[PDB]
Amino acid sequence: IQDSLSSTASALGKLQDVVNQNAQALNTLVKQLSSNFGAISSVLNDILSRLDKVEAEVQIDRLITGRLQSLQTYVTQQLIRAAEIRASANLAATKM
Amino acid sequence: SRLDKVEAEVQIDRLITGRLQSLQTYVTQQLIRAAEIRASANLAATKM
Amino acid sequence: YICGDSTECSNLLLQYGSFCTQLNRALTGIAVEQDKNTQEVFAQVKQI
Amino acid sequence: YICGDSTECSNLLLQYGSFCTQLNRALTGIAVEQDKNTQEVFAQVKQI
Amino acid sequence: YGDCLGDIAARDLICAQKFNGLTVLPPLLTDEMIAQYTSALLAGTITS
Amino acid sequence: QCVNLPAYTNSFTRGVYYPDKVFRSSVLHSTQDLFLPFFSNVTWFHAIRFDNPVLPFNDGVYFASTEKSNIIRGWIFGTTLDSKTQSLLIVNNATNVVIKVCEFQFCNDPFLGVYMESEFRVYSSANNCTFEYVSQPFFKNLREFVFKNIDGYFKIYSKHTPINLVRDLPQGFSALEPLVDLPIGINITRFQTLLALHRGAAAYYVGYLQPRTFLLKYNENGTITDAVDCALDPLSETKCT
Amino acid sequence: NGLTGTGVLTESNKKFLPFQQFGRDIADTTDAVRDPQTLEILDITPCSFGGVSVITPGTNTSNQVAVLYQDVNCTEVPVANVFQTRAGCLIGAEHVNNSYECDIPIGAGICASYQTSQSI
Amino acid sequence: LKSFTVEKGIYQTSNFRVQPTESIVRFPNITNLCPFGEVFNATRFASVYAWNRKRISNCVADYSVLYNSASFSTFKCYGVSPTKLNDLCFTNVYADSFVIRGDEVRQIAPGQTGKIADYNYKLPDDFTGCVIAWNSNNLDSKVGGNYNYLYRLFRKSNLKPFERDISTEIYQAGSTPCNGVEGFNCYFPLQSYGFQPTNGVGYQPYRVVVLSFELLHAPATVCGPKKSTNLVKNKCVNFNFNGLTGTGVLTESNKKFLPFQQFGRDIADTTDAVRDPQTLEILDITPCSFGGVSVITPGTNTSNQVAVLYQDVNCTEVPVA
Amino acid sequence: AWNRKRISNCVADYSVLYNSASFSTFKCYGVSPTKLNDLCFTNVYADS
Numbered sequence A: 001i002q003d004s005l006s007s008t009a010s011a012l013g014k015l016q017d018v019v020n021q022n023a024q025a026l027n028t029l030v031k032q033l034s035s036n037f038g039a040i041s042s043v044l045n046d047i048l049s050r051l052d053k054v055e056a057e058v059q060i061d062r063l064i065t066g067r068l069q070s071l072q073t074y075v076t077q078q079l080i081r082a083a084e085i086r087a088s089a090n091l092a093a094t095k096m
Numbered sequence B: 001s002r003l004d005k006v007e008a009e010v011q012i013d014r015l016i017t018g019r020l021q022s023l024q025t026y027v028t029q030q031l032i033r034a035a036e037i038r039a040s041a042n043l044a045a046t047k048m
Numbered sequence C, D: 001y002i003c004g005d006s007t008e009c010s011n012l013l014l015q016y017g018s019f020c021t022q023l024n025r026a027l028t029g030i031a032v033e034q035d036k037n038t039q040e041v042f043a044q045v046k047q048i
Numbered sequence E: 001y002g003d004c005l006g007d008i009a010a011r012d013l014i015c016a017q018k019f020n021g022l023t024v025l026p027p028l029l030t031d032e033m034i035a036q037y038t039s040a041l042l043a044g045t046i047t048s
Numbered sequence F: 001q002c003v004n005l006p007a008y009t010n011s012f013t014r015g016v017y018y019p020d021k022v023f024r025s026s027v028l029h030s031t032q033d034l035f036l037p038f039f040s041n042v043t044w045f046h047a048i049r050f051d052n053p054v055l056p057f058n059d060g061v062y063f064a065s066t067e068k069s070n071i072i073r074g075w076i077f078g079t080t081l082d083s084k085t086q087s088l089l090i091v092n093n094a095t096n097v098v099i100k101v102c103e104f105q106f107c108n109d110p111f112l113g114v115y116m117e118s119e120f121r122v123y124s125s126a127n128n129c130t131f132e133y134v135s136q137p138f139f140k141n142l143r144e145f146v147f148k149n150i151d152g153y154f155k156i157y158s159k160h161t162p163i164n165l166v167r168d169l170p171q172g173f174s175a176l177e178p179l180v181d182l183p184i185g186i187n188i189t190r191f192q193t194l195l196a197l198h199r200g201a202a203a204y205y206v207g208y209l210q211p212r213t214f215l216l217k218y219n220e221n222g223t224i225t226d227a228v229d230c231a232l233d234p235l236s237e238t239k240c241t
Numbered sequence G: 001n002g003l004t005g006t007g008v009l010t011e012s013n014k015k016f017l018p019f020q021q022f023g024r025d026i027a028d029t030t031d032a033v034r035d036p037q038t039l040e041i042l043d044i045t046p047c048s049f050g051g052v053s054v055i056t057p058g059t060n061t062s063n064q065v066a067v068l069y070q071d072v073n074c075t076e077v078p079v080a081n082v083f084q085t086r087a088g089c090l091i092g093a094e095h096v097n098n099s100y101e102c103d104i105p106i107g108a109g110i111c112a113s114y115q116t117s118q119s120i
Numbered sequence H: 001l002k003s004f005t006v007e008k009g010i011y012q013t014s015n016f017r018v019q020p021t022e023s024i025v026r027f028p029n030i031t032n033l034c035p036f037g038e039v040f041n042a043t044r045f046a047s048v049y050a051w052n053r054k055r056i057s058n059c060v061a062d063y064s065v066l067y068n069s070a071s072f073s074t075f076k077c078y079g080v081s082p083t084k085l086n087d088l089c090f091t092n093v094y095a096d097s098f099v100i101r102g103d104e105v106r107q108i109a110p111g112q113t114g115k116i117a118d119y120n121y122k123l124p125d126d127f128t129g130c131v132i133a134w135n136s137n138n139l140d141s142k143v144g145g146n147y148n149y150l151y152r153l154f155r156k157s158n159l160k161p162f163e164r165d166i167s168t169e170i171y172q173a174g175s176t177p178c179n180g181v182e183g184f185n186c187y188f189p190l191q192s193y194g195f196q197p198t199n200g201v202g203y204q205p206y207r208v209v210v211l212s213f214e215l216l217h218a219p220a221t222v223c224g225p226k227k228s229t230n231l232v233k234n235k236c237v238n239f240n241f242n243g244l245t246g247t248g249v250l251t252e253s254n255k256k257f258l259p260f261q262q263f264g265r266d267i268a269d270t271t272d273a274v275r276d277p278q279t280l281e282i283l284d285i286t287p288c289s290f291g292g293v294s295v296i297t298p299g300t301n302t303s304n305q306v307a308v309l310y311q312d313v314n315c316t317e318v319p320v321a
Numbered sequence I: 001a002w003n004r005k006r007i008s009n010c011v012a013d014y015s016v017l018y019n020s021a022s023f024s025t026f027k028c029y030g031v032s033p034t035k036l037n038d039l040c041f042t043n044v045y046a047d048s
C-alpha cells in the first residue's frame, strides 16, 4: 500500500470529482452573468445610462428573472448533490 | 411568415422561455428518479 | 449577485418576494448538514 | 427541440447561455450512472 | 429515416419523439451477458 | 484615353480578425460572424502569367498578396463597372492613397504604368463624385486584406508581415485588425484588382468568406493566439462543445 | 400559400374534407397539405435525423477520431473502415476478432480502444 | 428573520457596504460647438433619391440653443431616451438630410414600407439614433409650383438599408425592351414634387434630418455639455466615464490597450479597465462591497448582547467595528 | 350605414397605388406590412 498510493492519483478519483463538480458549477454560475436574456445589453449600467426610468424597468425585470432562474437551478442541483453526499456519509458511518 | 424581424423576437423569446422551463422540469424529475433508482440498485447489490 | 449596487435594481427586486430568503435557507441547511455528517462519521468515541 | 431549424430561432437562442449544455451534462451523468449501477449489481464474480 | 417517413400515419409516437430530438440510448451490457453472469453465479453457488 | 492590353491553395488557418473593440485577456471567446473557413480553397494568380479578371463579390473577400516591389496598387468595386452605376475605386499611386465613389467609365483593361508613374489608364471619365478621400503625400512582403459590405458600410481590415518563401501561402496564425469603415452605401457585386505594369514579380490569392462560429483563445497580453472552427471536423465540434 | 417550411414531400393516403387545408400533429407542426393547383395531398417530413458521437483518445496523445452515427445503417449512406454495430454505424475504427476488457464503452456489448501504426 | 424575537445561534447578514461618498466626472475637453447653423439652416436640401450625408466630430452637442428659433413638428428617438442625451458621448455621428411630402413623413421608421421606404430611403431594423422633421411650406414652395425636388417611382427591387441609387435608366414594365426611349410600358423612373403654397397640409413640403450614432462601445469625440472633474485614485468613488456610470475604486493598470480599444471587460461583461479621456492612461476599476457578516446571539428572551464576525478579513486592516 | 364588400379571386398587388394615391393614415394589426406581398388571405372584406 505504501507505494500503491504513490503509483497514481486516480485511486482517489471518487474524492477528486467531489471537489471538481463543486467548482464546475460555481464557475458556470459566474459566466451566465454574461447572457443578454433578450435585453439590449447584459450590463445594468448601460441600461441605466441610456434609458429613462420608465423604459429601463422592462429590461431590468427580464434580467432579474433570468438571473433568478439561474440561481434556482444552481440551488436545486446543490440540494440533489447534498442528498447524495448524505447517503454516502451514512454508509461510511455504518461501515465505521 | 406573418411578422417582421422586430416583432417576431418578442414572441420567440417567450416561446423559448416556456420550452426551456419545460425542459428544466423534465431534467429535474429525471434526476430525482435517477437518485431513487440508484438507491434501489445499491440495495440490490448489497442483497446479492 | 443579481444587482451589484445600482439602487434602482435593488428597489425593483423587492416586488419578487422572498426568493432570496428561501435560497439562503436552503444553502444554510446544506451547510449545517455537512458538519452534521462529518461529526456523525468521525466523532464516535468519547475518550482520546 | 426548442427551434427545429428556422435559423432565426437558433440565433436568438444564443443569448440564453449554456442551459442546453447543463441539461446535456446532467443527462449524460444519469446515463453513465445507469451502466455503473448495472455493472455494480451483476459484475461481482471474475470467473465464468 | 427509411421507416419513420413511411406509411405510418402518426400511429407510433417513436417517430414523434425522434423528430423532436428525443433519443433513447442502448445499455452497455446486453441481456445475453447478464444471462451468462447469472449462469456463472448459479454454477458457483451450486458447486462450491 | 484607355487601352486594350487555375491554381488552388489551402487556407492554413488564416482569416481571423478582431471582432470588436474591447480588451480581453486569458479568456476564450465564441463569435458568430463572417470568417474564412479553415483549410478552404483559395484561388491563386500570378503577375510574373499576368491576369486580373473580374471576380464576383458574394458576401466578403479575403485578399492576400505576396510581393517585393509593390505590384498590387488597388481595387475597383461595383455592379456594372460603367457610367450607368456608381462605383468605388481605391488606388495607391506611389505618392497618395485615393478612395473615390463616382460613376466611373472604367477602361476595359485598367493598369498603372511605371517606367516614374507615367500612365493612368484606369477610367475614361469621372463624374457625380459623392465621396472622395486622399491622404497626406509620401518575395519579401505579404499583405492580407478583408473586405465586408454590411448595411451600406464598407469595412476593410488589414495586416502585413515579411515572408521570404517562394510560392505557397505561409502557414501560421495571423490576426487582422480593423483598418477603415466607410459610408459608401452602394451596390457591390463584382470587383477587379489593379496591377502596376512596368515598361511584375508578384502573386496573390483570393477567397470568399462564409458565416461561421469561431472560438478564439486570447493571450495574457492583448492579442489572440489560436482559433477553432466549429464546423471543420467532428473533433472541432467536440472541442467547441 | 404563405406558410414557410422545410422538409421532404411525399404523396399521402390522407383524405381531407373540402373545407380542410392543413393537417396538424400533436405538436401543432404541419403534417399534410393540399396542393393549391393539383389538389393532391402531400405529407411533409423533417430532414434532420440521427445522433452523432465522437470517439477519441486524449488530444495529448493523438488526433485520430472515430464517428458513430446512431439509429442508421451504413448501407443507406448519409455517412462519411466501416462497422455496423447494434448501436449504429461506426466509421474510422477497424474490427478485430479478439475480446479484451472494455476501455471506451460504445454500447450493445461493443467497446473501443487505441492500440498499436497505432489506430482505434 | 422577519420577527421581533431571535433564538440562540448564528445568522448571516448582508455584505459590507463601503459607500463611495464621492462623484467624479471625466469627459474629453472639447470646446467647440456642433454644426447647428450650417446644417439646420441649410438653404438647399438634397432630394430624397439623393439624400445628403454628413459626418460630425469634435463638438459639444448642446441643443438648448434650438429653443429660440426652431420648432419641429415631428421628433423621435430609438435606442436612447431623450432625457439622457445631455449626459452621453457619441462615437460616430452621421446626419442625413432631405425633403419629402408631408404624408410620407411617417414612412421614415424601422420596419416601414411604401414608396419612400422601399424605393428612395430605408432604415435598418436595429437602427439607433433620432429622426427630426419639420414643415417648410414658406421656404421650399413658391408661386407657380416648385419642381426642383424629385423622387423615384419605379424600381426592380427594394433598397437595402442606407442604400443610395442615382441611376436614371428607362424602367421597363412590359416584355418589350425600352431602347432608351419612352413608350408603352416604358417610363422615366423619376418624378417631381408639385409643391405649392396653397396645397393642403398633407401636400406641403417637409424637411427631414436623421441622426445616426453608436453608444458606449468605441472612443467618442462628440459629447454633451457635461463638465469634467479631477481624477481620484485609491478611493471608492462614483464615476461617469464618457457616459458610462459606475461605482468603484480606481487604480493604475499594467494593461496596454490597442489604439482602437476603449474598454476592457471580464467574463461577466463588467467593466475592468478604462482609458482616461484626457490623460490617456489605463485605470483598473474594482468593486467596493466585500466581506460577509455574521451575527452571534443567544435567545433574545435572555439578553440583548451580540457578537459580530467579519469573514475573510483581518482586524488590523480595520473596516471593522 | 358603412358599406361592406367581399373580395375574392384576385392578386393583391398594391404597387400600382404609388402613382396616383396618397394616404395620410395607414395601420395594420396582426401582420407586418412588409410581408403583405408574400401571403394569401382567406376571407377579404372591405368597409368604406
Ligand SMILES: C=CC1=C(C)/C(=C/c2[nH]c(Cc3[nH]c(/C=C4\NC(=O)C(C)=C4C=C)c(C)c3CCC(=O)O)c(CCC(=O)O)c2C)NC1=O
Pocket: F070, F072, F073, F074, F075, F090, F091, F092, F097, F098, F141, F143, F158, F160
Ligand atoms: C490600396 C491603397 C492603401 C491602403 C487601402 C492602405 C494601409 C496602410 N498601409 C500602410 C504601410 C506600408 N504600406 C505600403 C504599400 C502598401 N500596402 C498595400 O496594400 C499597398 C497597395 C501598398 C502600396 C503599394 C508599403 C510599400 C509599405 C512599406 C512596409 C509596410 O508594409 O509596413 C499603413 C500604416 C501608415 C500610417 O499609419 O500612417 C496603412 C494604414 N495602404 C495603401 O496604400
Ligand SMILES: *[C@@H]1O[C@H](CO)[C@@H](O[C@@H]2O[C@H](CO)[C@@H](O)[C@H](O)[C@H]2NC(C)=O)[C@H](O)[C@H]1NC(C)=O
Pocket: F093, F094, F095, F096, F098, F117, F134
Ligand atoms: C496621386 O493622386 C493624387 C490625388 O489625385 C494626386 O494629387 C493631385 O495632383 C494634381 C497635380 O498633378 C493636383 O492638381 C491636385 O490638386 C492633387 N489632388 C489633391 C486632392 O490634392 C497626385 O498628383 C497623384 N500623383 C501621381 C504621380 O500620379
Ligand SMILES: *[C@@H]1O[C@H](CO)[C@@H](O[C@@H]2O[C@H](CO)[C@@H](O)[C@H](O)[C@H]2NC(C)=O)[C@H](O)[C@H]1NC(C)=O
Pocket: F079, F187, F188, F189, H156, H157, H158, H159, H160
Ligand atoms: C445589386 O446588384 C445586383 C446585380 O445587378 C442586383 O441583382 C440583380 O437584381 C435584378 C433586379 O431584381 C435581378 O433581375 C437580377 O436577377 C439580379 N442578379 C443577381 C446576380 O442577383 C441586386 O438586385 C442589386 N441589389 C438591390 C438591393 O437592388
Ligand SMILES: *[C@@H]1O[C@H](CO)[C@@H](O)[C@H](O)[C@H]1NC(C)=O
Pocket: F008, F009, F010, F040, F041
Ligand atoms: C478545390 O477545388 C477543386 C475543383 O476541382 C478541387 O479539385 C479541389 O479538390 C478543391 N480543394 C483543393 C485543396 O484544391
Ligand SMILES: *[C@@H]1O[C@H](CO)[C@@H](O)[C@H](O)[C@H]1NC(C)=O
Pocket: F127, F128, H050, H166
Ligand atoms: C449626375 O451626372 C448627370 C450628368 O452630368 C447630371 O445630370 C446629374 O445632375 C448628376 N447628379 C445626380 C444626382 O444625378
Ligand SMILES: *[C@@H]1O[C@H](CO)[C@@H](O)[C@H](O)[C@H]1NC(C)=O
Pocket: F220, F221, F222
Ligand atoms: C505579451 O506582450 C508583452 C509586451 O511586450 C511582451 O513583452 C510579451 O513577450 C508577450 N508575451 C507574454 C507571454 O508575456
Ligand SMILES: *[C@@H]1O[C@H](CO)[C@@H](O)[C@H](O)[C@H]1NC(C)=O
Pocket: G036, G037, G038
Ligand atoms: C391552374 O389551376 C387549375 C386548378 O383549378 C389547374 O387545373 C390548372 O392545371 C392550373 N394551370 C396551370 C398552368 O398551372
Ligand SMILES: *[C@@H]1O[C@H](CO)[C@@H](O)[C@H](O)[C@H]1NC(C)=O
Pocket: G072, G073, G075, G085, G086, G088
Ligand atoms: C439495415 O437495412 C436492412 C434492410 O432492412 C435491415 O436488415 C437492417 O436491420 C438495417 N440495419 C440495422 C442495424 O437495423
Ligand SMILES: *[C@@H]1O[C@H](CO)[C@@H](O)[C@H](O)[C@H]1NC(C)=O
Pocket: H036, H037, H040, H041, H066, H069, H070
Ligand atoms: C437660422 O437663421 C436665423 C436668422 O438668420 C437665426 O435666427 C437662427 O438662429 C438660425 N438657426 C440656427 C440653428 O442657428
Ligand SMILES: *[C@@H]1O[C@H](CO)[C@@H](O)[C@H](O)[C@H]1NC(C)=O
Pocket: H029, H277, H278, H279
Ligand atoms: C485637454 O485634452 C488633451 C488631450 O489631447 C490633454 O493633453 C490636455 O492636458 C487637456 N487639457 C486640460 C486643461 O484638461
Ligand SMILES: *[C@@H]1O[C@H](CO)[C@@H](O)[C@H](O)[C@H]1NC(C)=O
Pocket: H313, H314, H316
Ligand atoms: C492579516 O495580514 C497579515 C499580513 O500579511 C497576514 O499575515 C495575515 O495572514 C492576515 N490575516 C489572516 C487571517 O490571514
